[PDB]
Amino acid sequence: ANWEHLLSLKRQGDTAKRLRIEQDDTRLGFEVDYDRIIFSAPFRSLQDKTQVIPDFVHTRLTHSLEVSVVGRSLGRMVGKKLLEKYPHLEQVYGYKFNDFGAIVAAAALAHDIGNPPFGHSGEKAIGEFFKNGYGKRYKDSLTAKEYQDLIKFEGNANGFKVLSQSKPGAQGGLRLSYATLGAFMKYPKESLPHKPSDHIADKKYGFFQSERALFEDVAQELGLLKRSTTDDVSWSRHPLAYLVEAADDICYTIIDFEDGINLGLIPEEYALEYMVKLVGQTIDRNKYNALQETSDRVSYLRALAIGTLINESVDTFMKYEEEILAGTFDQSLIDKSNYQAQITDIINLSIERIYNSREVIEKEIAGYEILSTLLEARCRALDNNDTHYNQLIQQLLAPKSLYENLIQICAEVSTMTDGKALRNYKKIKGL
Amino acid sequence: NWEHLLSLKRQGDTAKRLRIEQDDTRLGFEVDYDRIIFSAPFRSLQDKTQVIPLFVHTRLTHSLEVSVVGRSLGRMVGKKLLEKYPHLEQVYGYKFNDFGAIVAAAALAHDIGNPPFGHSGEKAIGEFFKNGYGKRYKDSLTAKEYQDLIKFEGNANGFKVLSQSKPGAQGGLRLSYATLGAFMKYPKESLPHKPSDHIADKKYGFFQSERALFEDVAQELGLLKRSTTDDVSWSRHPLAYLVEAADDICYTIIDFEDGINLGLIPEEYALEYMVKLVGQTIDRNKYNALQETSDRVSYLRALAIGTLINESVDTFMKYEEEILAGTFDQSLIDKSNYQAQITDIINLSIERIYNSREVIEKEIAGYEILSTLLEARCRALDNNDTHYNQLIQQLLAPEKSLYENLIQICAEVSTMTDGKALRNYKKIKGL
Ligand SMILES: [Mn+2]
Numbered sequence: 001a002n003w004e005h006l007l008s009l010k011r012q013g014d015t016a017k018r019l020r021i022e023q024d025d026t027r028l029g030f031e032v033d034y035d036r037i038i039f040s041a042p043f044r045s046l047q048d049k050t051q052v053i054p055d056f057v058h059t060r061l062t063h064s065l066e067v068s069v070v071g072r073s074l075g076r077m078v079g080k081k082l083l084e085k086y087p088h089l090e091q092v093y094g095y096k097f098n099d100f101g102a103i104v105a106a107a108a109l110a111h112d113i114g115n116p117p118f119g120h121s122g123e124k125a126i127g128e129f130f131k132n133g134y135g136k137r138y139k140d141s142l143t144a145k146e147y148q149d150l151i152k153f154e155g156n157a158n159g160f161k162v163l164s165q166s167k168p169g170a171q172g173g174l175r176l177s178y179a180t181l182g183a184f185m186k187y188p189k190e191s192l193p194h195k196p197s198d199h200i201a202d203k204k205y206g207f208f209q210s211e212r213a214l215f216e217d218v219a220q221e222l223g224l225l226k227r228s229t230t231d232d233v234s235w236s237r238h239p240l241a242y243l244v245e246a247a248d249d250i251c252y253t254i255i256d257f258e259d260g261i262n263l264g265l266i267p268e269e270y271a272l273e274y275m276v277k278l279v280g281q282t283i284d285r286n287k288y289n290a291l292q293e294t295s296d297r298v299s300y301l302r303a304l305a306i307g308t309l310i311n312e313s314v315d316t317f318m319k320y321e322e323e324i325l326a327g328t329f330d331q332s333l334i335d336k337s338n339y340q341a342q343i344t345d346i347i348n349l350s351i352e353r354i355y356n357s358r359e360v361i362e363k364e365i366a367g368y369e370i371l372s373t374l375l376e377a378r379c380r381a382l383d384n385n386d387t388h389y390n391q392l393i394q395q396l397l398a399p400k401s402l403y404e405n406l407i408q409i410c411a412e413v414s415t416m417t418d419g420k421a422l423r424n425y426k427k428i429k430g431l
Numbered sequence: 432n433w434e435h436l437l438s439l440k441r442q443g444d445t446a447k448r449l450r451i452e453q454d455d456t457r458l459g460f461e462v463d464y465d466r467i468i469f470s471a472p473f474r475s476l477q478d479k480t481q482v483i484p485l486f487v488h489t490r491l492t493h494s495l496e497v498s499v500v501g502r503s504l505g506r507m508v509g510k511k512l513l514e515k516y517p518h519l520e521q522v523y524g525y526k527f528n529d530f531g532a533i534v535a536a537a538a539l540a541h542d543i544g545n546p547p548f549g550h551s552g553e554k555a556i557g558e559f560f561k562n563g564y565g566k567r568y569k570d571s572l573t574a575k576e577y578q579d580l581i582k583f584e585g586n587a588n589g590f591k592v593l594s595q596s597k598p599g600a601q602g603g604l605r606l607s608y609a610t611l612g613a614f615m616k617y618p619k620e621s622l623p624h625k626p627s628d629h630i631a632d633k634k635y636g637f638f639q640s641e642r643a644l645f646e647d648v649a650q651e652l653g654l655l656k657r658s659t660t661d662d663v664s665w666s667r668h669p670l671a672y673l674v675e676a677a678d679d680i681c682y683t684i685i686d687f688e689d690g691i692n693l694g695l696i697p698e699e700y701a702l703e704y705m706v707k708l709v710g711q712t713i714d715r716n717k718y719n720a721l722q723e724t725s726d727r728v729s730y731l732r733a734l735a736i737g738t739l740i741n742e743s744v745d746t747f748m749k750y751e752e753e754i755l756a757g758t759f760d761q762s763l764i765d766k767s768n769y770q771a772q773i774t775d776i777i778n779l780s781i782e783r784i785y786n787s788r789e790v791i792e793k794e795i796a797g798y799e800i801l802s803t804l805l806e807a808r809c810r811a812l813d814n815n816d817t818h819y820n821q822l823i824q825q826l827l828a829p830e831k832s833l834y835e836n837l838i839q840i841c842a843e844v845s846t847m848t849d850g851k852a853l854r855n856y857k858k859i860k861g862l
């Protein structure tokens with residue numbers, strides 16, 4: 001693959017090439033991408049959507065913002081080293097190290113934009129509705145891939161639809177640069193086959209059947225390498241996708257842990273115990289000992305640990321840069337960390353004390369009821385749009401092919417805020 | 432001199448920071464942005480109301496949008512400044528994105544010190560010390576100390592949040608001095624009160640508790656001294672005009688947009704008030720094809736903001752030497768050719784949003800919530816010996832002057848999210 005092509009500035013529907021050298025420095029396509037996400041309705045909605053815990057706890061927006069900041073740093077540092085390794089990219093094509101920061105920052109800002117409320121239980125609730133709920137009836141009317149899109153409904157694939165949703169007067173959705181869409185695509189495959197390997201890029205899927213033709217255009221423009229040997233399509237990751245993934249990995253590992261401590265779910269003593277190897281060479285022990293509040297000590301450790309992992313991930317990427325370019329790299333960047341034992345201890349403690357706390361379990365149980373009810377109401381009205389009641393349901397929840405209609409119902413349920421889903425649920429139940 | 436106005440100095444520095452010696456991947460101005468993003472005060476803006484009670488903009492998404500608009504203003508102005516004064520780049524090593532970085536960080540922080548409940552929030556705090564319980568401190572405070580309190584200023588509290596030292600954290604967030612300079616749109620103490628009608632004299636920008644800190648900042652930047660008595664003031668850092676412009680553009684157009692999507696302003700007013708602002712750049716076929724009100728008004732908003740950014744850049748360069756000399760007496764937007772349309776927009780927003788029952792009700796309740804919290808804190812300060820007042824201290828604040836204690840009480844009440852302020856209020860009243 002060619003970095004020249006991986007850094008495409010193309011937007012959907014373009015009829016002429018966009019030369020990097022001719023970009024206006026005050027309107028660089030990669031940086032416009034960031035601003036477009038910031039002002040978009042789907043991004044704004046993340047303000048009222050939950051990450052893990054339903055006092056201050058990170059929302060999807062604040063999480064996405066922090067990932068995009070760590071991502072910009074990764075892309076900036078890697079970009080400087082890529083331009084030193086491949087100097088024609090600058091001298092000939094005019095790329096600059098801040099271009100790489102901008103691409104990673106933008107894709108990182110949007111990486112969770114398609115996620116449904118109630119976190120991962122939300123996805124499972126939607127899939128179960130089509131696996132064994134009312135949605136079962138549609139199986140015989142859908143292709144294997146169309147149905148697999150529903151029973152394994154994936155927030156990452158919905159995020160791609162949100163970024164690229166064509167509408168009357170708004171073709172191409174947000175019309176992000178193709179390099180940014182490539183960096184966003186962690187799982188460059190369709191829903192079938194299911195886990196053809198245990199490579200991270202094969203663990204899930206990245207686009208619905210409704211968006212297959214769009215990602216084909218993206219993958220062709222970027223010159224991504226074909227990976228699947230069959231009629232099921234799969235491509236090797238855009239190299240910058242590894243940096244979006246590492247920014248995400250670093251943030252939820254360390255910041256969930258910090259939230260769990262500040263919330264009282266994790267005892268404080270674990271902060272120094274689990275992060276001491278991650279911070280040992282850079283911590284200022286006199287500064288730490290002078291800090292009086294728990295939250296300031298943990299935030300100091302978090303900042304040191306994120307700094308350590310950013311620097312290491314940049315070094316990992318450069319060490320394996322040619323394997324990533326050739327699609328032969330089989331792991332995440334963080335998988336190769338020398339602190340993998342510390343990262344695993346941190347994650348397993350977060351799982352035990354946060355994800356399995358009674359409050360998270362109660363929200364997940366409630367999310368199953370809410371989402372299932374909304375899906376059944378939308379689907380029963382789809383099947384019998386003529387009755388007076390189903391018309392009211394349509395007015396309240398949604399003011400094409402069967403598959404197109406079902407994937408749209410999932411996308412609309414998924415982008416409801418936590419509060420709108422509860423309200424619509426209560427009204428359908430009468431409260 | 433622009434070479435001193437672009438200082439990379441941080442609090443406590445013992446040696447000069449030359450721009451030419453900065454690591455491009457760790458540029459001081461860009462690090463400032465990251466430090467704000469991850470700070471507790473910035474995160475707290477998640478749960479703080481801007482105008483309408485809690486889609487609606489919070490302080491967080493407002494600050495985010497202002498920082499994006501400010502980054503564009505600074506990028507465009509930075510490019511023109513470097514062509515006007517080429518030695519800044521050729522000799523000193525400054526680049527046009529430095530100016531974008533300084534404005535973006537200062538704009539991101541511009542409302543970080545604001546209390547809950549809007550500008551009624553500040554007025555409720557001032558009223559507590561003017562006519563409420565806090566009036567008893569008047570004769571134990573200097574004129575400027577008391578004026579700090581009765582005209583409690585969110586901008587001055589922001590400067591406190593950004594810069595104030597605590598054990599283990601000297602210098603607060605330790606932002607670059609150029610960023611602190613661009614943050615300071617009122618470079619004066621609380622007295623004298625409005626010595627002129629210039630926008631820079633309308634309020635004040637630092638408490639007495641932070642006067643020595645801004646003296647260091649102003650000396651390092653070389654700000655022109657505007658007052659010679661023992662009442663100090665300086666001419667604004669030129670980039671403060673761009674922070675102010677980005678803020679003005681955002682709340683003017685975005686509050687209008689919010690008001691239409693909430694139903695408070697009939698949609699027909701959108702095209703009517705914004706036709707001049709968008710007419711030369713609007714694609715009518717696109718506009719007419721958009722089916723949803725929210726899509727039509729967000730398209731007009733994007734176009735109007737783009738128009739005002741371009742014009743503001745031109746206004747800045749036209750008056751650049753007067754701003755550098757401290758003789759510019761107006762805001763950039765005050766010079767806009769669209770002042771008629773801006774005024775109409777603001778007046779309708781005032782009538783339909785600011786004076787709506789929902790906002791009025793919320794501001795009236797905030798007065799009672801903040802007055803109650805302030806009184807509990809001051810009573811506990813006045814008599815720390817009683818059992819009740821010890822419980823209040825455990826609940827709300829778990830050796831300094833009277834003035835420093837009162838300013839900290841104000842800063843801490845201002846730090847509270849809307850929700851945490853209400854809960855603590857309810858407990859005090861037993862609800
Ligand atoms: Mn994430």
Ligand SMILES: [Mn+2]
Pocket residue numbers: 493497541542678682
């Ligand atoms: Mn503002």
